[PDB]
CSV table of C-alpha atoms in Angstrom, one decimal:
chain,number,residue,atom,x,y,z
A,2,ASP,CA,1.8,10.3,1.4
A,3,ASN,CA,1.0,7.3,3.1
A,4,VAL,CA,2.9,4.6,1.2
A,5,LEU,CA,7.0,4.5,1.0
A,6,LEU,CA,7.0,1.2,-1.5
A,7,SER,CA,10.5,-0.6,-2.3
A,8,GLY,CA,13.3,1.5,-3.8
A,9,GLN,CA,12.1,4.8,-2.7
A,10,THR,CA,13.0,7.1,0.7
A,11,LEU,CA,11.8,9.5,2.8
A,12,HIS,CA,14.5,11.6,3.9
A,13,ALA,CA,15.8,13.6,7.7
A,14,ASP,CA,12.5,15.3,9.2
A,15,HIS,CA,10.0,13.9,6.2
A,16,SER,CA,6.8,11.4,6.8
A,17,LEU,CA,4.3,9.6,6.3
A,18,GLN,CA,0.8,10.2,7.4
A,19,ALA,CA,-2.9,8.6,7.4
A,20,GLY,CA,-5.6,10.1,9.5
A,21,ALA,CA,-3.9,11.3,13.1
A,22,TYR,CA,-1.6,9.5,12.5
A,23,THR,CA,2.0,10.4,10.7
A,24,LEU,CA,5.5,8.3,10.4
A,25,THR,CA,8.6,10.1,10.6
A,26,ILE,CA,12.2,9.6,10.5
A,27,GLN,CA,14.1,12.2,11.8
A,28,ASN,CA,17.6,14.1,11.0
A,29,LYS,CA,18.7,12.5,14.2
A,30,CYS,CA,18.0,8.9,13.3
A,31,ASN,CA,14.6,7.9,15.9
A,32,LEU,CA,11.5,6.6,13.4
A,33,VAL,CA,8.7,8.1,15.6
A,34,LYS,CA,5.3,7.2,15.3
A,35,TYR,CA,3.2,9.9,16.5
A,36,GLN,CA,-0.8,9.9,16.9
A,37,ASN,CA,-2.3,14.3,16.4
A,38,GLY,CA,0.8,14.6,17.6
A,39,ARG,CA,2.2,12.3,20.3
A,40,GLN,CA,4.7,9.8,19.9
A,41,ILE,CA,2.8,7.0,20.7
A,42,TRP,CA,6.7,4.9,19.4
A,43,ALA,CA,9.8,4.4,18.2
A,44,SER,CA,12.8,3.3,17.0
A,45,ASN,CA,14.3,4.4,20.5
A,46,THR,CA,17.5,5.5,18.1
A,47,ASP,CA,17.6,9.3,19.0
A,48,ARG,CA,21.0,10.7,17.9
A,49,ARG,CA,22.5,7.4,17.2
A,50,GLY,CA,23.2,9.4,13.4
A,51,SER,CA,22.3,12.5,11.6
A,52,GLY,CA,21.6,13.0,7.7
A,53,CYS,CA,19.0,10.0,8.3
A,54,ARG,CA,16.6,8.7,5.9
A,55,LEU,CA,14.1,5.8,6.8
A,56,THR,CA,14.3,3.0,3.3
A,57,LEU,CA,12.3,0.5,1.7
A,58,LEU,CA,14.1,-2.4,0.3
A,59,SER,CA,13.2,-5.0,-2.6
A,60,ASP,CA,13.1,-7.7,0.1
A,61,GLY,CA,10.7,-5.7,2.2
A,62,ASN,CA,13.1,-5.1,4.8
A,63,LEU,CA,12.9,-1.5,5.9
A,64,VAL,CA,15.8,0.3,7.4
A,65,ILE,CA,17.1,3.4,8.4
A,66,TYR,CA,20.8,4.6,6.9
A,67,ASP,CA,22.9,7.1,8.7
A,68,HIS,CA,24.3,10.0,6.4
A,69,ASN,CA,27.5,7.5,6.5
A,70,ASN,CA,25.2,4.4,5.0
A,71,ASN,CA,25.4,2.4,8.3
A,72,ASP,CA,22.2,0.4,9.3
A,73,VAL,CA,21.3,1.7,12.2
A,74,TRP,CA,18.0,0.3,12.9
A,75,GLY,CA,15.5,-2.2,10.4
A,76,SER,CA,12.2,-4.0,10.9
A,77,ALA,CA,14.8,-6.5,10.0
A,78,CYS,CA,12.0,-9.5,8.2
A,79,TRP,CA,12.4,-10.0,4.7
A,80,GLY,CA,10.3,-12.0,1.7
A,81,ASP,CA,11.1,-13.0,-2.0
A,82,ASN,CA,12.6,-10.0,-3.8
A,83,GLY,CA,10.3,-7.7,-5.8
A,84,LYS,CA,8.3,-5.2,-5.3
A,85,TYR,CA,6.8,-3.9,-2.1
A,86,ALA,CA,4.5,-1.3,-0.2
A,87,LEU,CA,5.0,0.5,3.4
A,88,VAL,CA,1.3,1.5,4.3
A,89,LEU,CA,0.8,4.0,6.9
A,90,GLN,CA,-3.2,3.5,7.5
A,91,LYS,CA,-5.4,5.2,8.9
A,92,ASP,CA,-6.1,2.8,12.0
A,93,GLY,CA,-2.1,3.7,13.0
A,94,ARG,CA,-0.2,0.6,12.2
A,95,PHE,CA,2.3,1.4,9.4
A,96,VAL,CA,2.4,-2.4,7.0
A,97,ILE,CA,4.9,-4.5,4.8
A,98,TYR,CA,2.5,-5.3,2.3
A,99,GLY,CA,4.3,-7.9,-0.1
A,100,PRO,CA,5.6,-9.4,-2.9
A,101,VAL,CA,3.3,-8.0,-5.8
A,102,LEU,CA,0.1,-10.5,-5.9
A,103,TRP,CA,-1.0,-9.0,-9.3
A,104,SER,CA,-1.4,-6.3,-11.6
A,105,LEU,CA,-2.3,-6.0,-15.4
A,106,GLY,CA,-0.8,-8.5,-18.0
A,107,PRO,CA,0.3,-12.3,-19.4
A,108,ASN,CA,2.3,-13.7,-16.1
A,109,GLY,CA,0.2,-10.8,-14.1
A,110,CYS,CA,-0.7,-13.3,-11.4
A,111,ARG,CA,1.9,-14.9,-8.4
A,112,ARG,CA,1.7,-18.6,-7.9
B,2,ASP,CA,-7.4,7.7,-0.8
B,3,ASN,CA,-4.7,5.6,-2.9
B,4,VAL,CA,-5.0,2.8,-1.4
B,5,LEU,CA,-7.7,0.3,-1.1
B,6,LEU,CA,-6.7,-2.8,2.2
B,7,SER,CA,-8.1,-6.4,2.6
B,8,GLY,CA,-11.7,-5.6,3.7
B,9,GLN,CA,-12.2,-2.7,2.4
B,10,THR,CA,-15.0,-1.2,-0.7
B,11,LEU,CA,-15.0,1.6,-3.4
B,12,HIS,CA,-18.3,2.5,-3.7
B,13,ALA,CA,-19.6,3.5,-6.1
B,14,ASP,CA,-19.1,7.2,-7.8
B,15,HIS,CA,-16.0,6.8,-5.8
B,16,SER,CA,-12.3,6.5,-6.4
B,17,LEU,CA,-8.7,6.3,-5.6
B,18,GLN,CA,-6.1,8.7,-6.9
B,19,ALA,CA,-1.7,8.6,-7.7
B,20,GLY,CA,-0.4,12.4,-8.9
B,21,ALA,CA,-2.5,12.0,-12.4
B,22,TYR,CA,-4.6,8.9,-11.6
B,23,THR,CA,-8.2,8.5,-10.8
B,24,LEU,CA,-9.4,5.4,-10.6
B,25,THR,CA,-12.6,5.1,-10.4
B,26,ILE,CA,-16.1,2.3,-10.1
B,27,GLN,CA,-18.7,3.4,-12.0
B,28,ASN,CA,-22.2,2.3,-10.5
B,29,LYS,CA,-22.7,1.0,-13.5
B,30,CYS,CA,-20.0,-1.7,-13.5
B,31,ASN,CA,-17.6,-0.1,-15.4
B,32,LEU,CA,-13.5,0.0,-13.6
B,33,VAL,CA,-12.7,3.1,-14.9
B,34,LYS,CA,-8.8,4.7,-14.9
B,35,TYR,CA,-8.1,8.3,-16.5
B,36,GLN,CA,-5.1,9.8,-16.3
B,37,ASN,CA,-5.9,13.7,-15.9
B,38,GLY,CA,-9.2,13.3,-16.3
B,39,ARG,CA,-9.3,11.1,-19.8
B,40,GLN,CA,-10.0,7.6,-19.5
B,41,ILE,CA,-6.7,5.8,-20.4
B,42,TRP,CA,-8.1,2.0,-19.1
B,43,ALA,CA,-11.6,0.5,-18.3
B,44,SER,CA,-12.3,-3.1,-16.9
B,45,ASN,CA,-14.9,-2.3,-20.0
B,46,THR,CA,-17.5,-4.0,-17.4
B,47,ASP,CA,-20.0,-0.5,-18.2
B,48,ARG,CA,-24.0,-1.5,-17.8
B,49,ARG,CA,-23.1,-5.2,-17.1
B,50,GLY,CA,-24.6,-3.8,-13.5
B,51,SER,CA,-25.8,-1.4,-11.3
B,52,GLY,CA,-24.7,0.0,-7.2
B,53,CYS,CA,-21.5,-1.9,-8.0
B,54,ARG,CA,-19.0,-1.6,-5.4
B,55,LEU,CA,-14.5,-2.8,-6.1
B,56,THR,CA,-13.3,-4.6,-2.8
B,57,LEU,CA,-10.6,-6.5,-2.0
B,58,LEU,CA,-10.7,-9.3,-0.4
B,59,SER,CA,-8.2,-11.4,2.5
B,60,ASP,CA,-7.0,-13.1,-0.7
B,61,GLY,CA,-6.0,-10.5,-2.5
B,62,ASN,CA,-8.6,-11.2,-4.7
B,63,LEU,CA,-10.3,-7.7,-6.5
B,64,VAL,CA,-13.9,-8.3,-7.1
B,65,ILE,CA,-15.7,-5.9,-9.2
B,66,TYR,CA,-19.5,-6.6,-7.3
B,67,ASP,CA,-22.5,-4.9,-8.5
B,68,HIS,CA,-26.0,-4.2,-5.9
B,69,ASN,CA,-26.9,-8.4,-5.7
B,70,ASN,CA,-23.7,-9.4,-5.2
B,71,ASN,CA,-22.8,-10.7,-8.4
B,72,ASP,CA,-19.5,-11.1,-9.2
B,73,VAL,CA,-19.0,-9.2,-12.3
B,74,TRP,CA,-15.5,-8.5,-12.5
B,75,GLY,CA,-12.4,-9.1,-10.1
B,76,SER,CA,-8.2,-10.1,-10.7
B,77,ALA,CA,-9.0,-13.5,-10.9
B,78,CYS,CA,-6.2,-13.9,-9.3
B,79,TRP,CA,-5.1,-14.6,-5.2
B,80,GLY,CA,-3.1,-15.9,-2.3
B,81,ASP,CA,-3.3,-17.1,1.2
B,82,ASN,CA,-6.1,-15.6,3.2
B,83,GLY,CA,-4.3,-13.3,4.9
B,84,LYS,CA,-4.3,-9.3,4.1
B,85,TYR,CA,-4.1,-7.1,0.9
B,86,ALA,CA,-2.8,-3.5,-0.6
B,87,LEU,CA,-3.7,-2.3,-3.2
B,88,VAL,CA,-2.1,0.5,-4.8
B,89,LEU,CA,-3.0,3.2,-7.3
B,90,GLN,CA,0.6,4.5,-7.4
B,91,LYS,CA,1.4,8.0,-8.5
B,92,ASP,CA,2.7,5.6,-11.6
B,93,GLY,CA,-0.5,4.6,-12.8
B,94,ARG,CA,-0.5,0.7,-12.7
B,95,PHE,CA,-2.7,0.3,-9.4
B,96,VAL,CA,-1.0,-3.7,-7.8
B,97,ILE,CA,-1.9,-5.3,-5.4
B,98,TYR,CA,0.3,-6.3,-2.7
B,99,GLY,CA,0.3,-8.8,-0.7
B,100,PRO,CA,0.1,-10.8,2.0
B,101,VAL,CA,1.4,-9.1,4.8
B,102,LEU,CA,5.4,-9.5,5.1
B,103,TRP,CA,5.8,-7.4,8.3
B,104,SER,CA,4.3,-5.0,11.5
B,105,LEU,CA,5.9,-4.2,14.7
B,106,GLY,CA,4.3,-6.5,17.2
B,107,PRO,CA,5.6,-10.0,18.4
B,108,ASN,CA,4.6,-12.2,16.1
B,109,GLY,CA,5.0,-9.3,13.3
B,110,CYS,CA,7.3,-10.8,10.7
B,111,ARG,CA,5.9,-13.6,7.8
B,112,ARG,CA,7.8,-16.6,8.6
């Protein structure tokens, strides 16, 4: 899995993976990015909670919630409400794209 | 792969895959979608050319180009120049999300 769509959840100890990269939301709440197992970046929120999960909101904001729903860390960046996609890319970057520009259907093109 | 980023190209006979869905740009220019190996959708541009490829532009426009670089078919929908992502979703819908909302970095949040 290399994509997390808005509204979806990555639960404790699960990861996104692309090429040599992995993005894991750890049970103890640290969101960590690895390159061949080497920690290259982290939200630096280890042990700030337990049973943590990662979710992408309808406005594109990326947030880590602990089991009691406290907002542990977030990209703290939002756009208009709609549908977004977090992509862990083979180049190591995890980018949030959105909202929807196009898909099939009548008024399927934004603006 | 289930994602096609701006600047990337899916070449003739190659496809995106997600769950039970496959999206193939055929050499003869027809973009075909399959559900468990069975065609359920097509751009309906078969034989409009040869050596065709599918690419996503920096403005989010999705285009099928033949080997002579003629625009055979496209989403004919675009936004500001930036970065977009075409995602073939597990539910079978292929959606173009963009532009970038957020990424790690000093100027990572759109607006």
